[PDB]
Design a protein around this ligand. Structure first.
Ligand SMILES: [Ca+2]
Ligand SMILES: [Ca+2]
Ligand SMILES: [Ca+2]
Length: 637
């Protein structure tokens, strides 16, 4: 508020939203103009300090005063980083006389940071439909049996000496004595998914479908691939897939949709002809003969029983990617008829790939997270984007996936376990996603969220797969002990946060479930109606996100972190809208004075809480709103 040898952190702000960055996804020829907010008349000088990888050196760009915001409460300073194809990282040095502060991806700091700088990755682009959409994940066998004739029946077939077992819809997922949990089937198929597209694209509003494995495999999950080129008969055939894809892409049954498939490229099942451990094919697999034409596709320590596999599971023999140009890299992604390209090109034209166990992909049986792994995912990107620049690549990773995204040469994003699923779980349910006791306060939540966002480039952040739960962790509804209000709170946050809101089938109505396989229960369609509280909220929240671009690609600013009342408030805003989200994580209601002046909401102007429908007036930079415990409001204008 004045030149007093003091930089006020509360008035400072910057991120790569439209108000502060004119080129979030620049090419080699586009310069980047940045704006830094501060309280009006608070500083004396500011400078942009950026590291240029082309020059392995720091560069300085003094900033100049640009303007004030409509409310005359803040100043905006600007500076431009020149154009070039090189990746750069920047931070701000902010001075007010004898007071100096720094600011980067992690926010304000008294001392200069050495990490979490903002990213500038020329020519790096993630599909905008991914940044702006809402995803719905489906575990095929448990969503909807659209065709009873292709159902796996009890004893239909055997796998490793165990018969398959069919279950009545709604029954327990656990295998009865004599059967295996991996061979329990309910009948869910592609025809069913197709027949329920209205529910997904209209009742809910989700425009993106992500499916767990659908290719030929003996198990329930099908991560033990037997044939990447054929849809498993239990789910239909390749034509059944084409029809589904066309109906998903169609706008005659709702909004234009996108299809993302699960790509299991680190390994195959042990029954794949390349391996053929049980001799299910006349051809000779690697397990059968060292003269097998596919022998080299795998790594044997002691042929044929000891070989590299996924975490020791013999049913999952690991693929050897060898050096560039290898036959394996060829069948998986380089060949026009490879698994990756086949489904991306017509007559399929799917829209993306979810990369299973992506961190392990490697050569000679090694375990990835190395130079070879990253080289492979680099060529993978080239192969994919070369066929469809708008095809999504989302790798599976439970920690900081910066290594596979920050270079702009590998994935578009990743499964946001670390930056979304875990923090949300611990804040709202007091448990980690494994249902183990782990709780965090509101201030910790906000700190966790910011720190994890800072791990990634802005476009990557906006494309992260943010799910409350999935096929590998306990259901949110179980972690919350059945308290549906906790699901309410989780949904409101999910639909208003940075990254692709991802709904694991059932979560929208509060489905429960423990650890795999109980987290893959059949879907109860009588609960699949807005008559169900959670469902109605979901539809409403999705409608809201689609209505406000600021919610998908806008800036994110922390507004309130109250650990006594358990209130968390943040804003999402761009050049058109300003939205203050207010969440009540307490078990009682609270009346909150939201400081919407921080988002520059003019006084006297009104805002509407899209959740309830009630309207409010901005008084003295504030907006007073009463919020129920474990619930929230979305004040937009
Ligand atoms: Ca000052
Ligand atoms: Ca079926
Ligand atoms: Ca054979």
């Amino acid at each position: 508020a004045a030149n007093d040898n003091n930089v006020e952190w509360n008035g400072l702000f910057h991120d790569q939203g439209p108000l502060f960055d004119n080129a979030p996804e620049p090419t080699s020829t586009q310069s980047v103009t940045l704006k830094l907010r501060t309280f009006k008349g608070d500083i004396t000088s500011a400078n942009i300090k950026y590291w240029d990888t082309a020059d392995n050196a720091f560069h300085w760009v003094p900033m100049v005063w640009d303007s004030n915001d409509p409310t005359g409460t803040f100043d905006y300073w600007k500076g431009t980083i020149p154009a070039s194809p090189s990746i750069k990282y920047y931070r701000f040095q902010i001075n007010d006389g004898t007071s100096t502060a720094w600011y980067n991806g992690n926010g304000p700091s008294s001392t200069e940071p050495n990490a979490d700088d903002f990213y500038i990755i020329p020519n790096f682009k993630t599909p905008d439909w991914l940044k702006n959409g809402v995803m719905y994940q489906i575990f095929p066998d448990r969503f909807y049996n659209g065709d009873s004739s292709n159902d796996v029946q009890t004893g239909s077939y055997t796998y490793n000496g165990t018969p398959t077992e069919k279950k009545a819809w709604g029954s327990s997922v656990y295998a009865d004595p004599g059967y295996d949990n991996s061979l329990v089937f309910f009948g869910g198929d592609l025809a069913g998914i197709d027949q329920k597209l209205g529910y997904i694209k209209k009742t809910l509003g989700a425009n993106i479908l992500y499916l767990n494995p659908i290719f030929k495999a003996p198990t329930n999950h099908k991560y033990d691939t037997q044939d990447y080129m054929a849809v498993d008969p239990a789910f239909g055939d390749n034509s059944t897939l084409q029809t589904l894809i066309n109906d998903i892409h169609s706008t005659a049954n709702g909004p234009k949709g996108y299809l993302i498939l699960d790509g299991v490229f680190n390994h195959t099942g042990d029954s794949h002809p390349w391996f053929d451990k049980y001799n299910n094919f006349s051809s000779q697999g690697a397990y059968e003969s060292q003269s097998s034409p596919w022998y080299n596709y795998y790594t044997f320590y002691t042929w044929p029983d000891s070989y590299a596999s996924f975490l020791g599971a013999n049913s999952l023999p690991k693929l050897n990617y060898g050096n560039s140009g290898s036959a394996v890299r060829g069948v998986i992604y380089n060949n026009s008829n490879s698994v990756a390209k086949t489904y991306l090109n017509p007559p399929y034209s799917v829209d993306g790939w979810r990369l299973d166990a992506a961190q392990y992909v490697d050569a000679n049986g090694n375990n990835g997270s190395d130079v070879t792994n990253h080289q492979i995912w680099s060529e993978f990107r080239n192969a994919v984007k070369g066929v469809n620049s708008n095809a999504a690549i989302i790798g599976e990773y439970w920690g900081n996936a910066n290594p596979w995204t920050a270079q702009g040469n590998q994935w578009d994003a990743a499964t946001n376990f670390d930056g979304f699923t875990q923090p949300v779980s611990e804040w709202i349910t007091g448990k980690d996603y494994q249902n183990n006791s782990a709780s965090i306060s509101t201030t910790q939540f906000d700190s966790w969220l910011r720190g994890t966002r800072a791990n990634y480039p802005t476009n990557v952040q906006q494309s992260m797969m943010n799910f409350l739960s999935n096929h590998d962790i306990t259901r949110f509804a179980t972690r919350s002990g059945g308290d549906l209000w906790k699901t309410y709170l989780a949904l409101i946050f999910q639909m208003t946060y940075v990254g692709t809101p991802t709904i694991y089938y059932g979560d929208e109505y509060g489905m429960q479930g423990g650890a795999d396989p109980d987290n893959r229960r059949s879907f109860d369609w009588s609960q699949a109606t807005p008559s169900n509280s959670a469902v109605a909220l979901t539809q409403k929240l999705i409608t809201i996100r689609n209505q406000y671009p600021a919610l998908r690609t806008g800036s994110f600013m922390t507004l309130i972190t109250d650990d006594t009342n358990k209130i968390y408030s943040y804003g999402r805003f761009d050049n058109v809208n300003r939205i203050a989200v207010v969440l009540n994580n307490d078990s009682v209601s609270h009346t909150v004075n939201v400081p919407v002046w921080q988002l520059s909401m003019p006084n006297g102007s009104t805002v509407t809480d899209k959740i309830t429908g009630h309207s409010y007036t901005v008084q003295n930079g504030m907006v007073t709103v009463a919020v129920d415990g474990h619930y929230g409001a979305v004040l937009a204008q």
